[model samples]
Target: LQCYNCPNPTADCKTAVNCSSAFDACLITKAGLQVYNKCWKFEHCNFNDVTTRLRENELTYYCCKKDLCNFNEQLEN
Candidate 1:
């Protein structure tokens, strides 16, 4: 499956990573002034996993599964 690995705020650079050890397609979103998107190979399923902290710029995280799932996504308005 194709996953995205790059700087936090851009999705221009992407590559394919063969999933090993029963991994799942994943996407992580870091929301901020320059909200970031990441497509990763995650173990197991946590479709609605999220975390936040006030001291950490109040960032947000989200994860989901499927091949090339995070290619065309954006933060909610």
Candidate 2:
């Protein structure tokens, strides 16, 4: 699968990388007034498990099983 690996808060996406069996195409989105977005490979994406890091950070992540599925999507608040 093709995965996006780059930093957020930018107007450009570097490129998409080919993912191995050990990786899954994942999208990490932070929801708020000014939302943040990120797409990359996650080591483990099982049963659509979603987790939160710092409460103050307030980010929402959704993992999928499709090629380049993480591109141009947002986790709306």
Candidate 3:
């Protein structure tokens, strides 16, 4: 699979990267104006699993299973 990978927040963040065999998704961590992208493991996408951890920082995330899917900055419940 392929996905966009950006380590963290930046003025403009979105880069294409090949997904490793161990991972099956793309990650988007949104923090107000800051949005971070990363390759994600499908196993941990339990929504609550990651969201609970993000709660500590009052941040939120969205995971997708397509190339450049993480490019989106907004998510719906």
Candidate 2 local lDDT, 1-77, one digit each (tens): 67655544433455676765555565645445433334434654322333333233444556676766665454555
What is the C-alpha lDDT profile of model 3 across 35-59, one tens digit per residue? 6677888888765666675553556
| Model 2 clashes, total count | 0
Model 1 per-residue lDDT tens digits across residues 1-77: 54554444654436545455444565645546444445544642243443321123444454556655554354452
* Model 2, runs deviating above 4 Å: 7-11, 31-56
Candidate 3 runs further than 4 Å off: 46-56
Error of 3 at 30 (Å): 0.5
Candidate 2 to native Cα RMSD, angstroms: 4.5
CA lDDT, every model vs. true structure: 0.47, 0.50, 0.72
Greater-TM-score candidate between 1 and 3: 3
**Candidate 3 accuracy as lDDT:** 0.72
Per-model C-alpha RMSD = 4.7, 4.5, 3.0
Residue 53 displacement in candidate 1 (angstroms): 12
Best by TM-score: 3
RMSD of 1: 4.7
Which 10-residue window in model 3 sums to the lowest lDDT? 50-59
